[PDB]
Symmetry: C3
Subunit: 482 residues, 3 copies
C-alpha cells in the first residue's frame, strides 16, 4: 500500500502476420503489407496512355494498308495492342526482318503517311488483285503501288526522290515473286525483273524468284517487303526493270515512348499508369508478379508471388519482458500501474510516434517509382530462331533473377530493421522511466518497476508526463528500500 | 564476509578463422564456412541428367549423318558433350548460321528423324562420294539425298511436302557448289543451278557457286547447309533446277531443358546436379568459381575464389566476457563461472547458446537458396572473331558476373556483421538477465562478473543459472554486507 | 560542493551534412563524402593510354586508305577517338556489317599492314578515280587494288595466298557495283561478275548489283567492303570473273585492351585512367554520372548525380551529457568527458572510443566495392541510325545494367550510413557504460548522460576515471555516506 508498481509494455494483436527477416525464417509481427502485385483486373485502361486497339489488324498490316485495316491510316499511339485474332486479308506477303520493321514502327508511334509524286512514266500503276478486295472491289495495299506493263512494255524505271525535310523518311516497298513464267512475262515484260533501291549511304538489291508457291487466298505468288530510311539531304533512288512493288510516299519515323504489346485483354475506360498483357495493374507496390512484359510506370517483375513487409513490431499475444498488451489500442507502447488508487493504463505517445515515423515511408528510401519503361525487347516468342532469341531470353532471365534477389534481400533487411527499431523504442522507454525514478524504484526484471513510495495516480501521471521529481520522494523511497 | 563472484562469459577457440564484415576488414570468429565452390572432381556425372558423349562427333555432323556419327542416329540428350577432338569425315560443307542451327538442335535435345517419301522422279538419287565413305564404300550424309541428272537430264523439280502433324518440322537441306563448270554441267545438266525452298511464310533461294575451293579430303567442291522449319498446316515446297542436296525427312524440334556443352572431361558413373566443362561440381554452396558455363541446378558463378561466412561469434582467445573469452568452455557458447564458499565452478547457459545458434543456422538460406536452375543459355567462349553479336554476348555475361560478385560480396559482409552483432547481443542479454535476478544483492564488478554480497553456495549459484534465484531471501543479508 | 559531475558526450559541428539512411530520408551528420563523380575536365588525357585522334578520319577510312587518312597507316592505339567532323573523300562505298568491322579492328588496336604479291596477270591493276584524288591525282584506296579488264579481256582470276605464319591475317576486299550495264561490260568483260573469297573454314560469294546510285564525288557506282580472316596453315583463295576490288595484303589482327570512342573532347597532356566522351574523369569515387560510355579503370555509371556517404556521427547542435545534446567545442576527439568539480569545469576527449569509431569508418566502402571495374572494348551505347531488333537488345542490356547498379548504389549508401550512425551511437553508449562500471556505487545516473559522483573528486580523480584507473573502493565509504 506504501508502494507502487509501474509496468512498461507494448501492444499486441490476436491476428498477427508472419514476415521474414535476416534473423528469423518466420516471425509474427502486428502488421505487414504486401510488396508484390499479383493480380490484374483484366482490362487495359485507356488513360493516361494513348491506346490503339489493333483489333483484327497487326501493325504491319496497318502499315502496308490491308483494306480491313484502313481505319488505322495516319493514327498514332503510345501503346499499340495486337490481338491474337488478327489476320491478313490482302495480297500474300512476307517480311524479311519482320521483327525489326514491326519494332521500329511500333517505337515510332505513328502511321502518318505522306504521298509523293513518283514519276512512273512508261508503266501501268495501281495494280489490283481479287486477293485484296477493298469495299467489294479488287484492290491492293493502300500504301503500295503495284506497277506492271503498259501496252506490253515495261521500260526500265529510274526514279529519284530527295529528302528535303529535316526528318528521316521511312519508305516501305516490295518485290513481286510470280508463280509462273507466264505470269512473270505477262506482268513484267522481261523474263526476270530486278529491284535496286539505294541512297547515298545504302544499297538494297532484290532479284525476284519465279516459282510455284503454296496457294494463299487464291494466289500462287507472294511479295517480299523491305524498308529504306532516307536521312535529310539524302536521296532515294529506285531502279527497276520489273517486279517492283513501289512505295507511294513515306512514313514519318519518330523517336519517343511508343511501343507495341500483344494482348487479348479488353480496353476499359479507366486510368492506370502500368499496362501488362493481362491488363492494367496498380503500381503502389514496388514489385509485380503479373507479367514480365510491362509498359508505363510499373512495378518491377520478380519471381516471388508474395513479399510481406513488416509495418509493426513483433507480435507477442507484467511488463514487456513477458508479453504484449492486446488491450492497449491507443498506442504502441505504454504504462500499466498498480498503486493505492487501483489500476490504470496509458500509452506513451513519444515512443509510439518514434516507431511509426521510422516505419512510414520505410521503403521509399531505397525503391521509388523510378521504373518507367516504354519500348523494350520482346519476351515471348512463337518461332524457333536460335542465337539472337537465346540472347534476348538470357538477358531477360538474368534481369529477373537479379531483381528477385534484390527484392528478397531488401524485404529481409527492412523487416530485420523494423523489428530492431521497435525493440529499441521499447528499451528506450524503459530506460527513460528508470532514469526518472533514480533510487526510488527497483527493476523487478519483468519490464516493471517497484516504486518504493506511496504514488497515487497523479504521481504515476508525473512519471508518464516526464515531470516526476525523484528528490521529492527519495527520503521516503530510500527508507522503504533499505 | 562470506560472498561469491559470478562471472558471465562466452567460449573461445585457439584456431579462429578470419572473416570480413561491414565494420572490419578482417575479424577472427570461432567458426566460419566457405561459400565459393572452387574445385571440381574432373568428371561429368552420368546422373541425373541424360549425358550424350559426342566423342569424335560434333552435334551438326551427327545431325547431317557423317558416317562415323551413325551411332548417334535418333538419339536424345539432356546435355550433349562436344569434345575438342571431334572431326568431320564426310563431304566438305559449311553452315551459314552454324551457331543458331547448333543451338536450336541442342535445345531440342533429340535427333529423332522421320523419313518422308519425296517424289524425285526425273533425277538420280543417293549420290555418293569418295570423301564420305561408309563401310569402306562411297557414300554420303545419311540424312541428305544428293540428287543429280538421270540419263543426261535434270528436269526442274517441284516437290511438295505438307505438315499435317501437331508439331513443327525441322528440314535440313543443302546446295552443292561444284569446283568447275565441267562438274556443274556433268552433274546437273543446266549451266547454273538454283534452289528455292519455300513455305507459306518463308522463301530461301540459293545460287550455287562454280569455282575452286581449298582442297579438302580430295574434293575441290563444297556444300552449303540450310534449315527450314515447317509449322503445322504449312507446306514445304522445294524447287530446284540443279545442285539441290535434298532432305530425306524431318527432325522433331521439341522444347525442353536440353543443351550442349564443350568439354573434354570424362563421363563418370556418379550423381551430381551441376555440370561444368571442368566436370561436375557440388551445389551445396551458393556460389562457385569453377566455370561460368554451367548446366543443371548450380551455384552462381562469381569472380571471388573464396567467401568465408561466419558461423560463430568473435574469437577472443584465452574472468568474465569483458576481459576475454573462455577456451575452457567446450559444452556451450555462453555460460557462468563462479567462486563461492564451496570453491570454483563452470556451467554453460543453454538458453543463450541455443538462441545464437538458431539464429545462425540457415541464415543464408533465408536470402538465397538453390533457385538457380539453368539449362540452355548463351555461349560464353568463342574461338572466332565475329564482331557485334559476340560483343553483346560477352558484355551481357560480364555484366551478370560483376553484379552477382557484388551481391556475393555485400551479402557475406552483411551476414557476418549481423552474426557478430547477434552473438554479442546474446552475451549482453545473458549478463542483463543475471543482473535483473540479483536485484540489490550483487554489484557489477565491471569485468563481466557480479560480486554477490551474501553466502551463495553451489545450489544458490545453480538457482541463478536456472532462473529460480529469489533475491528477497538474501536481501537482508546482502544489504548488510554492501553498505558500511 | 562535496560532489562532482561527470558528463559523457560527443562532438558536434556547426556545418553538418544531410545524408540518407534506412531510417531517415535526411539526417544531419558531422561529415560526409560524395560517391558520385559528376564533372569532367573536358579534355582526354594522353596518358597512360595510347590515344589516337582520328581527326577528320573514321577508323574504317583509315583502314581502307582514304587519301586524307594516309597519315594513319600502320598506326596502333589503345583508344581510337572518332570525331563527329570526320568525312569520307574517296570512292563511294558501304560496309555490310560496318559495325562489326569497326568493332573488331578497334579491338585489335593496330593498322599494321603487310603487302603481299598477288599474281593479277591478265587484268589491269591500280584503277584510279576522280572520286579519290591523292596529291591532286586520280587515285584509290591505298590498301585496295581496283582490277579491271586488260585490253578488252578479263580472264577468270584464281589467285591463292597461304598463311604460313603463326598469327591470323585480316584481309579487306571489295566488290564493285557499276551504275549501268555498259559500265559493267566496259570495265569487266562479262555482263555479270562474280567474286568468291574462300578459306578451308569459310566461303564468301558476292554477285555485283548493277544499278544507278545518287551521284557522289562524280561517281554513280559504289563498292561493297568485306573482310576475311585466314588462320595459320589456312589458305586464302580469291576467284573472280569481274568486279573484284582486290586486297593488297593483310592486316595484323591482335587481341587486347583496345577500343574506339566517339568524342569531340580535345586531347590534353595529363594522366588519367578513366576516359569518357566528355573527357577524362577521376576514378577515386566508386560511381560516376558523367557518361555510360567509359574506357579504363572507371567508376560505375549510375543515374544519381549525388550520393553522400556519412563519414561521421549524427550532428546534434549544442553541464549536460550526450542525451540532451552534442558538444560543439570538442575539437581533439569524437567522444570525451566534461566534468565539474571543486576546481571548476573541464573537458577532455576519449581516445579509445574516438579511434574505435574512426578505424571502423575508414575504408568502410572498400570492404564492399573496390575498383573492380576495368572496362575496355564493350558494346556501343549511342546510336545514330534506326536498326530495330539488335539495337533494341543493346539498348535494353545497357539500361538494365545501369538500373541495377543504380539500385545497388542507392541501397549501399543507405545501408552504410545507417551502420555508421549505429556504430557511432554505440561507441557513445559503450563509453557511458564503461564509466558507469568504474564508478560502482559511488555515482548515480542523472538521466542526461551525466553521473553525479557523490564524493570530492578533484581533477586528478577525474583524470583517473578518464584514464581507467579510478578505484571505487577508495571513495566508497565517503560516497555511500553522501548517497544514503
Ligand atoms: C508445283 O507443285 C505445286 C504443288 O503441287 C503446284 O501447286 C498447286 O497448283 C494447283 C493449280 O495451280 C493448285 O490448285 C488450286 O488449289 C486450290 C486449293 O484450295 C483450289 O481452291 C483451286 O481451285 C485450285 O484447284 C494447288 O492448290 C497447288 N498446290 C499447292 C500446295 O499450292 C504448282 O502448280 C506446281 N507448279 C507448276 C505445275 O508449275
Ligand atoms: C585454282 O587454284 C587452286 C590453288 O592454286 C587450285 O587448287 C589446287 O588444285 C590441284 C589440282 O589441280 C591440287 O593438287 C592436288 O593435291 C592433292 C592433295 O594435295 C594431290 O594428292 C593431287 O595429286 C593433286 O596434286 C591442289 O591441292 C589444289 N590446291 C589448293 C590450295 O586447293 C585449283 O585447281 C585452281 N582451279 C582451277 C580451275 O584450276
Ligand atoms: C538515273 O536517274 C538519276 C536521277 O536523275 C541520274 O542521276 C543523276 O545523274 C546526273 C548526271 O550524271 C547527275 O548530275 C550531275 O550533278 C553534278 C553536281 O550536281 C554535276 O556537276 C554534273 O555535271 C551532273 O550535272 C545527278 O546529280 C544525278 N542525280 C542524283 C540524284 O544522283 C542517273 O544518271 C540515272 N541513271 C541512268 C543510268 O539513267
Ligand atoms: C521451279 O522454278 C524454276 C525457276 O524459275 C522454274 O523454271 C523456269 O521455267 C520457265 C519455263 O520456260 C523458264 O522460262 C525459266 O527460265 C525457268 N527457270 C530456269 C532457272 O531455267 C520451274 O519451272 C519451276 N517449277 C516448275 C514445276 O516448273
Ligand atoms: C536503272 O535505270 C536505267 C536507266 O533507265 C536502266 O538503264 C537502261 O536499261 C535498259 C534495259 O536494260 C537499256 O536498254 C538502256 O540502254 C539503259 N539505259 C541507260 C542510260 O543505261 C537500268 O537498266 C536500270 N537498272 C535496274 C537495275 O533496273
Ligand atoms: C571528412 O571525411 C573525409 C573523408 O572521409 C576526410 O577526408 C580524409 O582525410 C584524411 C586525413 O587523415 C585523408 O588521409 C583522406 O585521404 C581523406 N579522404 C578523402 C576522401 O578526402 C576528412 O578529413 C573529413 N573531415 C573532417 C573535418 O574530419
Ligand atoms: C573460278 O575460277 C575458274 C578458273 O580457275 C573459273 O573457271 C573458268 O571460267 C571460264 C568462264 O566462266 C571458263 O571459260 C573456263 O573454262 C573456266 N575454267 C575452268 C577450269 O573451269 C570460274 O569461272 C571461277 N568462278 C568464279 C569466279 O565464280
Ligand atoms: C498496417 O499496415 C498497413 C500498410 O502500411 C496500413 O495501411 C495500416 O494502416 C496499418 N495499420 C493497421 C492495419 O492497423
Ligand atoms: C517524268 O519522267 C519522264 C521520263 O522520261 C519525263 O519524260 C516526264 O517529263 C516526267 N514528267 C513529270 C511530270 O515530271
Ligand atoms: C498473365 O498472363 C501470362 C501469360 O499471358 C500468364 O502466364 C500469367 O500466369 C498471367 N498472370 C496473371 C496474374 O493473370
Ligand atoms: C562450423 O560451421 C559449420 C557450418 O555451419 C558446421 O557444419 C560445423 O559443425 C561448425 N563447426 C564447429 C566446430 O562448430
Ligand atoms: C511421282 O510424281 C510424278 C510426277 O511427275 C508422277 O509422274 C509419278 O508417277 C509419281 N511416282 C511415285 C512413285 O510417286
Ligand atoms: C575450369 O576450366 C576452364 C576451361 O579450361 C578454365 O578457364 C578454368 O580456369 C578452370 N577452373 C577450374 C577451377 O578448374
Ligand atoms: C602468274 O600467273 C601467270 C598466269 O596465270 C603464270 O603464267 C605465272 O607463272 C604466275 N607466276 C607466279 C609467280 O605464280
Ligand atoms: C556528357 O555528354 C553527354 C552527351 O554525349 C551528355 O548527355 C552528358 O550530360 C554529359 N555529361 C557531363 C557530365 O558533361
Amino acid at each position: 500500500n506504501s508502494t507502487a508498481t509501474l509496468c512498461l509494455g507494448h501492444h499486441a494483436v490476436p491476428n498477427g502476420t508472419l514476415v521474414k527477416t535476416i534473423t528469423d525464417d518466420q516471425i509474427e509481427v502486428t502488421n505487414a503489407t504486401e510488396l508484390v502485385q499479383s493480380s490484374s483486373t483484366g482490362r487495359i485502361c485507356n488513360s493516361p496512355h494513348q491506346i490503339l486497339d489493333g483489333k483484327n489488324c497487326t501493325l504491319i498490316d496497318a502499315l502496308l494498308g490491308d483494306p480491313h485495316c484502313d481505319d488505322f491510316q495516319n493514327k498514332e499511339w503510345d501503346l499499340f495492342v495486337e490481338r491474337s485474332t488478327a489476320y491478313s486479308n490482302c495480297y500474300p506477303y512476307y517480311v524479311p526482318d519482320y521483327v525489326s520493321l514491326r519494332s521500329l514502327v511500333a517505337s515510332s508511334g505513328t502511321l502518318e503517311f505522306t504521298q509523293e509524286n513518283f514519276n512512273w512514266t512508261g508503266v501501268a500503276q495501281d495494280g489490283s488483285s481479287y486477293a485484296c478486295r477493298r469495299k467489294s472491289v479488287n484492290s491492293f495495299f493502300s500504301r503500295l503501288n503495284w506497277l506492271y506493263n503498259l501496252n506490253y512494255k515495261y521500260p526500265a524505271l529510274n526514279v529519284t526522290m530527295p529528302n528535303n525535310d529535316n526528318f528521316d523518311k521511312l519508305y516501305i516497298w516490295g518485290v513481286h515473286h510470280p508463280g509462273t513464267d507466264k505470269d512473270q512475262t505477262n506482268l513484267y515484260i522481261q523474263a526476270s525483273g530486278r529491284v535496286t533501291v539505294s541512297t547515298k549511304r545504302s544499297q538494297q538489291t532484290v532479284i525476284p524468284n519465279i516459282g510455284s508457291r503454296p496457294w494463299v487466298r487464291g494466289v500462287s505468288s507472294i511479295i517480299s517487303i523491305y524498308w529504306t530510311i532516307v536521312k535529310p539531304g539524302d536521296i532515294l533512288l529506285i531502279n527497276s526493270t520489273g517486279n517492283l512493288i513501289a512505295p507511294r510516299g513515306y512514313f514519318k519515323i519518330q523517336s519517343g515512348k511508343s511501343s507495341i504489346m500483344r494482348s487479348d485483354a479488353p480496353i476499359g475506360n479507366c486510368k492506370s499508369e502500368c499496362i501488362t498483357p493481362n491488363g492494367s495493374i496498380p503500381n503502389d507496390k514496388p514489385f509485380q508478379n503479373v507479367n514480365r512484359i510491362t509498359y508505363g510506370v510499373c512495378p518491377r517483375y520478380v519471381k516471388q508471388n508474395t513479399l510481406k513487409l513488416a509495418t509493426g513490431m513483433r507480435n507477442v499475444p507484467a511488463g514487456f519482458i513477458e508479453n504484449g498488451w492486446e488491450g492497449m489500442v491507443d498506442g504502441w507502447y505504454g504504462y500499466r500501474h498498480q498503486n493505492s488508487e487501483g489500476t490504470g493504463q496509458a500509452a506513451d505517445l513519444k515512443s509510439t510516434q518514434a516507431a511509426i515515423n521510422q516505419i512510414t515511408g520505410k521503403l521509399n528510401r531505397v525503391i521509388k517509382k523510378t521504373n518507367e519503361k516504354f519500348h523494350q525487347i520482346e519476351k515471348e516468342f512463337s518461332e524457333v530462331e536460335g542465337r539472337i532469341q537465346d540472347l534476348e531470353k538470357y538477358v531477360e532471365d538474368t534481369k529477373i533473377d537479379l531483381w528477385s534477389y534484390n527484392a528478397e534481400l531488401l524485404v529481409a533487411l527492412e523487416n530485420q530493421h523494423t523489428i530492431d527499431l521497435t525493440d529499441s523504442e521499447m528499451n528506450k522507454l524503459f530506460e527513460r522511466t528508470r532514469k526518472q525514478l533514480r533510487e526510488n524504484a527497483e527493476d523487478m526484471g519483468n519490464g516493471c518497476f517497484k516504486i518504493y513510495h506511496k504514488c497515487d495516480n497523479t504521481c504515476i501521471g508525473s512519471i508518464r508526463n516526464g515531470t516526476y521529481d525523484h528528490a521529492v520522494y527519495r527520503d521516503e523511497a530510500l527508507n522503504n528500500r533499505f
